Design a protein around this ligand. Sequence first.
Ligand code: 0CX
Ligand code: BGC
Ligand code: MG
Lengths: 373, 369
Amino acid sequence: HMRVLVVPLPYPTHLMAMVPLCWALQASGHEVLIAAPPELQATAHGAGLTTAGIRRFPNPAFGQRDTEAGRQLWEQTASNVAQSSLDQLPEYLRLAEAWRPSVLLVDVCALIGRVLGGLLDLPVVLHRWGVDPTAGPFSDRAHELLDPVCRHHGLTGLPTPELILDPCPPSLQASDAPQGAPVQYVPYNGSGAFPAWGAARTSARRVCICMGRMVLNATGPAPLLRAVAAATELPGVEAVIAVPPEHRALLTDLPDNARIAESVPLNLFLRTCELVICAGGSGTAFTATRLGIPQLVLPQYFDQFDYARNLAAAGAGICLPDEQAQSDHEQFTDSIATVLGDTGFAAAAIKLSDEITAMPHPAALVRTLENTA
Amino acid sequence: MRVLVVPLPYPTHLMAMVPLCWALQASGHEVLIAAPPELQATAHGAGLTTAGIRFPNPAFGQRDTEAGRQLWEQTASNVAQSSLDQLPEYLRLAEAWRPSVLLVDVCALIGRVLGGLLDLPVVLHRWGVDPTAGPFSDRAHELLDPVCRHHGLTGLPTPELILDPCPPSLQASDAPQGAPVQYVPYNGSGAFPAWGAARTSARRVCICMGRMVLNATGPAPLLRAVAAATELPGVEAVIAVPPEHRALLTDLPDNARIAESVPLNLFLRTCELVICAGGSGTAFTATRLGIPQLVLPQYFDQFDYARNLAAAGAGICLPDEQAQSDHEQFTDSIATVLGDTGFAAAAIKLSDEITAMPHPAALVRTLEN
Ligand SMILES: CC[C@H]1CCC[C@H](O)[C@@H](C)C(=O)C2=C[C@@H]3[C@@H](C=C[C@@H]4C[C@@H](O)C[C@@H]34)[C@@H]2CC(=O)O1
Ligand SMILES: OC[C@H]1O[C@@H](O)[C@H](O)[C@@H](O)[C@@H]1O
Ligand SMILES: [Mg+2]
């Protein structure tokens, strides 16, 4: 009987990536508690989970970690996360002392989970949400800043985790990421209602455009407007537009070949679509991949450029890699056409789907965790 | 598998099925809840996806009596009339989504009709104590065999499997044998309270009545439970009720805690008694956590659950209006439990019955086969 304390980064999307494992834990009779800043409360509660309370784009240099610009972005991200970890450390120590977890399930970027495991001598299981480009600059800066802290408390430095779980198709994972144990991606894109039109395809070429809140909060409307314009202008297309409610206002004068999806989890209808246009957020992208649906990716930040490049190398989609490509309406339209006219992209996407389904499901991982706790 | 889930339109019946629905999804199967408006917020609050669909009375515990037989017959009549009314809506759903298996609440007869009409296997799911043998079942056949026979069946079909989370010690003696599944608490989402971690030097007594019960009974079982609990020396009452029932708590002692929208399981291990109406997520969470109960049954299965719990030595029943309205019987029952560690001993015995059962993840294999 484990008591698993879950330590995500405080973005809704990173928690979602861990929800099927949390359900697998609870379905197998273990107890799960999510350490959640205000920003995560609603996401955790919405997955049926319980919480303990805590409290310029696109930018290709994120995918250029061999350059000084890219090293800086990742070093700054580690410095931000490390400072947060020192800030919140007392609250997380009080929580662990109160709840007495036997294992920490920790998002790969949530460095506080690693500090907490060292200081409390608890097994840490890191969880990737997807492509992990934290080797090199992020990881070196996290050690730079957190090894002294861990040494003051008697340890050699920031500890190496007991295990890293990895749902990324191996043929897409970053070459420098440490080996992780496979865990099969299970779509979880929130709750909601099966729409009537989600049951069958029509004669039109159905293209979903899905961009999430954190991406659009960062980027502003541009990638959404560029996608809606490219998709709706192409002969034959029906666009299904899936964006968060407050962003729906950005879509004035919408084309008659456009439906605005009403907070509907992608996996309820994505089997009826021939193409997904997205930013390379894992929930969207791995659901499409699992379902053998090719993607046109407009990467923006963090790991998105690596996902987009590697998906395109796999033949399973097209990448528009920077702002001159994403803002090239002709190239954008021709890329949608290219995918709708060549079944080889869907076929390459099913090859990746097979990499996913070769992995053990979250339910099968519960055993591994039992052995590590 | 593609599992379409057909609960009765009550939040608590769907909650009893949530951990299995999660176990199904964690093991790579697909799950959809057929949800009327009354179920939508519960389903989506468990992270699940939906297809939208458009007291006390001790006779419920006495199916040998004229009244007891008539209550359970009338309940089957109600459900059978509603299943016929809605049958064309569910048939359109099954055509749109194409399930391979129906996971159906024991009482949601539409699921059995639908399984028969579509030649799909039906896995019934008990939520706890199951008193549907006799009156309910006989009446369901009397009313639903005809539509089934019109479709060429022999009658309302026997289901493929009946999942049962009730510890056998507490189950009704006439419930056909089911396949045991470990009760996993699911009381909704919420926040771990500061004080839920540590025991106190006070005697911590949780009262948890619940929206559905209190909407049916009005305030009396809640306020009679608070009056009994707060009278006894050294007691700390922890009162768990829906947001809307918070305003009924007009005068509490200083040390009492109102736990609004806090799932019981986050703190119950620090309590020595739960006072409740029975059956339910509350009672099985108490029993799973080894906590004795004082049960004031109101309707349906609650009388059986209260009697069997008392028989097993893990609680006390206040069986009817005469007992529940008697503050001396009510206070003396609390004091009895607080004064005898044999109740907690018996409760722990049942907890172990529960935890010896296969968990919902282990049952996923059985459903596949
Ligand atoms: C499915 C639609 C409804 C139609 C309404 C009928 C009655 O109002 C309701 C009190 C009832 O009989 C029922 C309430 C439920 C139903 C059966 C068993 C439940 C055990 C308890 O937790 C509550 C019980 C029953 C029939 C019903 O729901 O019929
Ligand atoms: O099985 C013994 C008793 O169990 C109860 O559930 C029934 O309502 C009674 O009629 C019966 O005598
Ligand atoms: Mg590799």
